[PDB]
Amino acid sequence: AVISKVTYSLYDQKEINATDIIISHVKNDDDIGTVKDGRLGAMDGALCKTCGKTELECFGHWGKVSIYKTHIVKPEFISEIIRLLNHICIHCGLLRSREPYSDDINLKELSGHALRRLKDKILSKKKSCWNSECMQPYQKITFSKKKVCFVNKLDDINVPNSLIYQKLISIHEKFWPLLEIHQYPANLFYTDYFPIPPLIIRPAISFWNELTYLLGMIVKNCNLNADEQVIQKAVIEYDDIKIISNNTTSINLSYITSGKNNMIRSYIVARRKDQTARSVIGPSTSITVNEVGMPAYIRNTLTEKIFVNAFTVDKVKQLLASNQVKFYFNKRLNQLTRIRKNKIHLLPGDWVEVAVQEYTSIIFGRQPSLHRYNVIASSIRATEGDTIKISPGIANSQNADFDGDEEWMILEQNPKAVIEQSILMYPTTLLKHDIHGAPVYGSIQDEIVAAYSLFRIQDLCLDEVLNILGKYGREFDPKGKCKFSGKDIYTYLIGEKINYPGLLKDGEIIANDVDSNFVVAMRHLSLAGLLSDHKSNVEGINFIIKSSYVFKRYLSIYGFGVTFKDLRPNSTFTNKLEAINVEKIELIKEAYAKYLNDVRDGKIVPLSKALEADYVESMLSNLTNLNIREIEEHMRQTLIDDPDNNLLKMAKAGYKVNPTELMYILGTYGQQRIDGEPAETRVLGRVLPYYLPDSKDPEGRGYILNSLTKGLTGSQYYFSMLVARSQSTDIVCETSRTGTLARKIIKKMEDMVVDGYGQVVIGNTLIKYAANYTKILGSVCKPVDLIYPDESMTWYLEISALWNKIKQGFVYSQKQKLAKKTLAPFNFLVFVKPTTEDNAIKVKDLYDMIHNVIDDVREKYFFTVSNIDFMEYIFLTHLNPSRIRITKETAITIFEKFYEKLNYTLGGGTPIGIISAQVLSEKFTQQALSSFHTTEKSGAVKQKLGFNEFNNLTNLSKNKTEIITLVSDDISKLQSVKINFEFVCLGELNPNITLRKETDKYVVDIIVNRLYIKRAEITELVVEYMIERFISFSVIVKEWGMETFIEDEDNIRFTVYLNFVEPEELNLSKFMMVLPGAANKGKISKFKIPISDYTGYDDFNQTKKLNKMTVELMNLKELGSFDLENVNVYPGVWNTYDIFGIEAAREYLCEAMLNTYGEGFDYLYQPCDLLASLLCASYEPESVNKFKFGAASTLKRATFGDNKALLNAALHKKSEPINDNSSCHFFSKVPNIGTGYYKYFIDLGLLMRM
């Protein structure tokens, strides 16, 4: 009854011939013995002649058509046959070596790679057959896609299938471990019959079959006077047309396993469902985050199930008496009846279906479902209109606006699904984010400024406070006060006397202002997050509901609006900034023109174009920063003049207004960048014809002087529209790539779960010893401040010993960064209360408590295999008596909460892999669609940021260059490699090359400038060596001689005397053409090698100045000739694997995938590690595109997308157990995820006892 394992194989001929239905005719006056037979299955309007069942009960029966004297090849195993033909001769049948056949080898006992030693010897000898009666040359038989036969390619002759059949059945059974054979090779052919499939895969198409027509074209050639080529072509174009052709849209068998629209991806892991709905969404204030408003047409159409049992039989009889029952399902007769008076007897197991009532859990969601907070299950409320009314508090969880977004609903009224919807998918259960712990729900745009202004309000009456509180003013206690403030309203709203560093003290908010970090969803300073860290998710969800009510009542009483007078009250400041900009940009233009004229008349040597662009870039960036500082001073002066400005109010509250946006409105628009640089010059050295040819105007390259208040001019509007349309094109081009990578990572990581012992496993491989490094849920775990050891601490010795144990890993990013946060196992800071030293717990007893708890936890919960010294370090530094004294019951409360989080939170079956994959995928999709990662160009080669770098990391491509970083304390060792590897050519040194003919010699003078040699950071001897190496090794030069003259301290004349190989005039012109480029040195790359420097960490207290260098390099071989001692070398992923190993490859993949997200995303460390430990779970790094070493089943590979998965499983006779999601969804099995992680039994002892 429970399917364990599935075995794939090939049908042999005795199972194909095992049929009493012989198909013989193509057309007939009566379809008997034809391919549309009535005994091959029940058609539309006829019972099955084999079984007597109709179309919905007959699953079809097989037939056979007789191919008389032909051996029809199975069309998809052709390549395997081709492989089997590269191992034997065809005139004899023997193998291509004498060592299989001798009586000294004993092929049954050799293990390992000794079986693979002999096979490339078999594929090395292709001269002639080795036996005494066959010395024919070894043919290379190929399947001809042109005409359908098998064709020899030494000479174009058709090799018949009856001879490949004889030579493939001639191979003995005990040579099958050599040639990768697992069954009879006669199962690769149809030797005497062809199977005719049942009608259930080809029903009668009705609108006013293709496979039936293809089988008719097969049976139209099944005659005794018929070639095997025409029958082979009919069989091939019935099975797979792309074997002999290159056309799509033919409905063949391979159409069910062809690409994205194949059968499994479209109809097995996804389907169209009944009891569904879809509608536009709108907000609702009478709907909390735990509810959803359903329109009347949906609840007038959708039905809910009421099961018949001993509890609900009176309700079902009452609903049947009042005609409220819409459907009735009789389980014992197994039939559904629509009630439009009939007779219905209600037995237990039957059900009725009535209209869907309130407080029923509907599963609703928004698309695209990027992460699990898109698809939740909340309670139905009856609302008005035709829109699904959601709360605004869930809107940021679903990336939803009310500007035309649609959401879908599904009703799954199965009792197990009802319980799982009520518990697991309820929005109270999903309050905290499962990676970084911040609340998923909260306040949005207007409620942020309402929260800010409600905190800032003062001197209210009791009636004004109760008007603001509304329905929550029932239990408000005025202690003895008559005048109140907004801080008292917030103290009432929080309702707990908890402390938090920087936010709370005895319930009062000790922060200066309440901003968007306090109330908006997914923020690190949320008050609802602290209230749910204190007690439970119900308290955080209650704070969110009550806070949203009170903020909207503040907006109802006081209002919020931003007018035009708040932005631009007069013309004074904008006129001042306009005059400032038109003064400074003309100063920039005159300075640049003075430099250009000093170059043009010749008083200075010119710069490179990169350095000139950098200088103008710095001047325009200084003008932009001057505009920013003017905008900031105007904001300060406006809020000290008009302190009730609503625009500056929503700027101070933390919603979408900053000095940069106000600079765009009131100041300047800046420099418009395309691909990191300005817009490139087209025809005539310019972009637009509004500027002169080769115009040095920086405003014509994309610098906009105007703002949105003044209005952009035509050229400025061109450059702004160029940036806008470039961003639109880039997000459209990147959306599908992000979706493809997201699906690949989700299918790779989805089978990785937390097992019953707190470990992270996939299949039977242990990935992590402890889930989330704590064996506690990631929503419970708290990133707390890392406190470095100070000698004023109590137990500085123990704290410094723990820091010496765990201090590695806290210095990372090529020693550039020091860790400021660590991972507390839970938010214990809300349970810490300060206490005077007379009432406090004793200091030694607090150490004994911390040490005993950490030792007991390390024994009992981590099984003495995990290092949890970070937990002891956190409890010793954050509960340190040198900075905080606590009571004894405070410490008891903290450690009891610690044991509660270790005991109850994390459970086996937690889908940690698909949660981490969805979080990573949602983040890089958001950063790609939001254009968060701006491209910027620099001199050195740098590691890129963003989605394409993440995809290059997970692709793990081999034959590509890597960025290899060399860090050294001394700069001489980096300079010796930088001189030899950096590309410098003669043409980039800006030379003055002139030649003249002379009797016996062509003489070329190369007058180079010495400042150009110093800007390249080489010497004159380097240039002499470059020219000498090119001329001394070139083919076109017959004789030469070089001399070096001094012309000035500004000029060096390299004089070459030459005679070229005849024809000397063409070789002269070719030499003069290739001379500025081919006289070069170093590895050719577009990036230079500048030696950077920074401050690197040895520890928190000791640093050192370090010199850095980056080289694009394929291998590591050419570095092996240098004195690279005491030099840190950071290669790419494959050189790190080939030198240091698989663990260093895992570490590089972790930190490199983390670095693509940018600054401020350290919480993505724990997902990325979980991805990297999946890519390096075998002995070699494996990509996300293929399954090479990981044990993946055939249905997993077919659901991932692999069209030849079941064919390769049938060739190798694979027998695989059904333990993965893709294999459980195929056979309608419950996956081993979550509640399905456990098997459930029923103990019938207590029922039989009574």
Partner 1 sequence: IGNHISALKRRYTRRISLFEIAGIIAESYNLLQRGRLPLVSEFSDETMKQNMLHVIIQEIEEGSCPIVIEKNGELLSVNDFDKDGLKFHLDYIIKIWKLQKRY
Partner 2 sequence: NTITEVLKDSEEDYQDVYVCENCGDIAAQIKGINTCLRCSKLNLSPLLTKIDTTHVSKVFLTQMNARGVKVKLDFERRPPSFYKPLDKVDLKPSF
Partner 3 sequence: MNQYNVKYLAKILCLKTEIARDPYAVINRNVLLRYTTDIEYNDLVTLITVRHKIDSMKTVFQVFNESSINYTPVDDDYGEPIIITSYLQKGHNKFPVNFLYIDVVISDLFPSFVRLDTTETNIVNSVLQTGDGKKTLRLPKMLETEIVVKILYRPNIPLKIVRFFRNNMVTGVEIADRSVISVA
Look at residue 76 and give the partner it binds from partner 3, partner 1, partner 2, none, a contact being a CB closer than 5 to 8 Å depending on partner kind. partner 2
435 binds partner 3 (CB under 8 A): no
Which of 224-232, 474-482, 695-703, 1228-1236 is the region at the interface with partner 1 (rule: CB under 8 A)?
A: 1228-1236
| Residues 1007/991, Cβ–Cβ less than 8 Å | yes
Best CA proximity match to 1184, nearest among 1154, 1210, 1149: 1149
892 binds partner 2 (CB under 8 A): yes
Q: And the tokens for 201? A: 């895969």
DSSP string, 58-124: -----EEEE--S--EEPTTSHHHHHHHHSSB-SSS--BS-STTTSTT--TTT--GGGTTTTHHHHTT
Q: And the tokens for 30? A: 């009566």
d(CA 688, CA 706): 18
Range 1155-1174, binding partner 3 (CB under 8 A)? 1162, 1165-1166, 1173
421 binds partner 2 (CB under 8 A): yes
Look at residue 405 and give the partner it binds from partner 2, Mg ion, partner 3, none, a contact being a CB closer than 5 to 8 Å depending on partner kind. Mg ion
In this structure, the number of other CB atoms found within 10 A of the CB of residue 288 comes to 23
Question: Binding residue for partner 1 (CB under 8 A) from 8, 138, 176, 757?
Answer: 757
Look at residue 908 and give the partner it binds from partner 1, Zn ion, partner 2, none, a contact being a CB closer than 5 to 8 Å depending on partner kind. partner 1
Which of 655-663, 815-823, 1168-1176, 1225-1233 is the region at the interface with partner 2 (rule: CB under 8 A)?
A: 1225-1233
- Kindly report each contact of residues 374-379 with a partner whose C-beta sits within 8 Å and lies 24 or more positions away, as own/partner: 374/398, 374/399, 375/425, 376/425, 376/426, 376/427, 376/430, 377/421, 377/422, 377/425, 377/426, 378/289, 378/290, 378/291, 378/292, 378/426, 378/427, 379/290, 379/291, 379/292
Residue 289 or 1152: the one with the smaller Cβ distance to partner 1 is 289
Residue 980 CB, nearest distance to DNA (Å)? 23
Write the binding mask 28 to 67 for Zn ion: x where contact by CB under 5 A, - elsewhere.
--------------------x-xx------x---------
Look at residue 403 and give the partner it binds from Mg ion, Zn ion, partner 1, none, a contact being a CB closer than 5 to 8 Å depending on partner kind. Mg ion
Best CA proximity match to 504, nearest among 526, 484, 472, 537: 526
21 binds Zn ion (CB under 5 A): no
The one-letter amino acid at 766: L
Residue 205 or 865: the one with the smaller Cβ distance to partner 1 is 865
Residues in the chain after which the chain is broken, C→N over 2.5 Å: 208, 340
| Residues 440/521, Cβ–Cβ less than 8 Å | yes
Look at residue 141 and give the partner it binds from partner 2, DNA, partner 1, none, a contact being a CB closer than 5 to 8 Å depending on partner kind. none
Which of 186-194, 224-232, 760-768, 928-936 is the region at the interface with partner 3 (rule: CB under 8 A)?
A: 760-768
Q: Is the dihedral of CA 249, 252, 256, 257 positive or negative?
A: negative
Range 368-397, binding partner 2 (CB under 8 A)? none
Range 772-791, binding partner 3 (CB under 8 A)? 773, 783
Residue 1202 CB, nearest distance to DNA (Å)? 7
d(CA 1029, CA 574): 63
Residue 179 CB, nearest distance to partner 3 (Å)? 22
d(CA 766, CA 1174): 10
Which of 471-479, 586-594, 906-914, 981-989 is the region at the interface with partner 1 (rule: CB under 8 A)?
A: 906-914
Question: Binding residue for partner 3 (CB under 8 A) from 788, 812, 899, 1100?
Answer: 812
Which of 10-18, 224-232, 402-410, 585-593 is the region at the interface with RNA (rule: CB under 7 A)?
A: 402-410
CA angle 692, 697, 700 (to 5 degrees): 80
SS3 of 790, please? Answer: coil
Question: Binding residue for partner 2 (CB under 8 A) from 135, 201, 296, 732?
Answer: 201
d(CA 1209, CA 7): 9
d(CA 154, CA 144): 13
Question: Binding residue for RNA (CB under 7 A) from 403, 477, 791, 1062?
Answer: 403
Write the binding mask 740 to 769 for DNA: x where contact by CB under 7 A, - elsewhere.
x--x--------------------------
Which 3-state string (H, E, C) describes 504-545? EECCEECCCCCCHHHHECCCCCCHHHHHHHHCCHHHHHHHHH
Alpha-carbon separation of residue 855 from 874, 896, 1070 (angstroms): 14, 15, 79
Half-sphere exposure of 984 (CA within 13 A, CB side): 25
Best CA proximity match to 472, nearest among 368, 562, 542: 542
Question: Binding residue for Zn ion (CB under 5 A) from 6, 107, 134, 993?
Answer: 134
Write the binding mask 395 to 434 for Mg ion: x where contact by CB under 5 A, - elsewhere.
------x-x-x-----------------------------
| Residues 376/341, Cβ–Cβ less than 8 Å | no
Range 363-382, binding RNA (CB under 7 A)? 366-368
1242 binds partner 1 (CB under 8 A): yes
Which of 253-261, 584-592, 607-615, 682-690 is the region at the interface with partner 2 (rule: CB under 8 A)?
A: 253-261
Range 1084-1143, binding partner 3 (CB under 8 A)? 1116-1117, 1119-1131, 1136, 1138-1143
Q: And the tokens for 46? A: 């006829």
Question: Binding residue for partner 1 (CB under 8 A) from 76, 353, 420, 872?
Answer: 420
1235 binds partner 1 (CB under 8 A): yes
Best CA proximity match to 1022, nearest among 971, 974, 988: 988
| Residues 1166/1178, Cβ–Cβ less than 8 Å | no
d(CA 287, CA 409): 17
Which of 342-350, 669-677, 867-875, 978-986 is the region at the interface with partner 3 (rule: CB under 8 A)?
A: 867-875
Residue 760 CB, nearest distance to partner 2 (Å)? 22
How does DSSP classify residue 1230?
Answer: P
Question: Binding residue for partner 2 (CB under 8 A) from 32, 269, 579, 766?
Answer: 269
Look at residue 242 and give the partner it binds from partner 3, DNA, Zn ion, none, a contact being a CB closer than 5 to 8 Å depending on partner kind. DNA
Range 520-559, binding partner 1 (CB under 8 A)? 536-538
150-152 β-sheet, strand order: 141-143, 150-152, 157-159
Which of 4-12, 29-37, 502-510, 1018-1026 is the region at the interface with partner 2 (rule: CB under 8 A)?
A: 4-12
d(CA 37, CA 30): 9
Question: Binding residue for partner 1 (CB under 8 A) from 52, 368, 756, 1077?
Answer: 756
| Residues 1108/1096, Cβ–Cβ less than 8 Å | no
Look at residue 491 and give the partner it binds from RNA, Zn ion, partner 2, none, a contact being a CB closer than 5 to 8 Å depending on partner kind. none
> Which residues bind to RNA, rule: CB under 7 A?
205-207, 366-368, 401, 403-406
The site for Mg ion (CB under 5 A) is made up of 401, 403, 405
Report the interface residues with DNA, using CB under 7 A: 242, 246, 258-260, 270, 272, 278, 367-368, 735-736, 738-740, 743, 955-959, 1183, 1185, 1201, 1203
